[PDB]
Subunit: 90 residues, 2 copies
């Protein structure tokens, strides 16, 4: 169901997303995350979430501070003065 | 780390390990997850089929059972709960 993945911790959703590819579970984790206001950067291949309100927003990109989950370090990190180009959005 | 080792599931959070354990049933992952949980002093009660952890030193300890307070992961509510004056019978334990 959709509500279950809603309950799961974010770290659990990430594990599901990165290690159970091409499966239903991944599919619902992706959406569970989106509803939590995470967005997938299709290049960096990591999930981002606004830490606070962006500094600048145009029609093509926004810049500001974000927390993201680095799957290589398996840990939530933070980036300031980052430019999230919407063309890398799904 | 390499997904096929215990050092890998050791990096994951407990809740994730529980997810792995219940929803990737009968797989290598589940087994290594089970192991990961055991270093953390979680033990599997084979009747209730839930994981328990001593909250504090047990009150009584014999050869067949121990008694005291535990936290446990209820997989029907999917949440950590707590039990006082609980008897954990050693016959319902994976490996003595």
């Amino acid at each position: 169901t959709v509500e279950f993945y809603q309950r799961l911790s974010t770290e659990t959703l990430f594990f599901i997303f990165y290690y159970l590819e091409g499966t239903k579970a991944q599919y619902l984790a992706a959406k569970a995350l989106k509803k939590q206001s995470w967005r997938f950067h299709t290049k960096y291949m990591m999930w981002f979430q606004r830490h606070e309100e962006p500094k600048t927003i145009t029609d093509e990109f926004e810049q500001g501070t974000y927390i993201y989950f680095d799957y290589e370090k398996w840990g939530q990190r933070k980036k300031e003065g980052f430019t999230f180009e919407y063309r890398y959005l799904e």
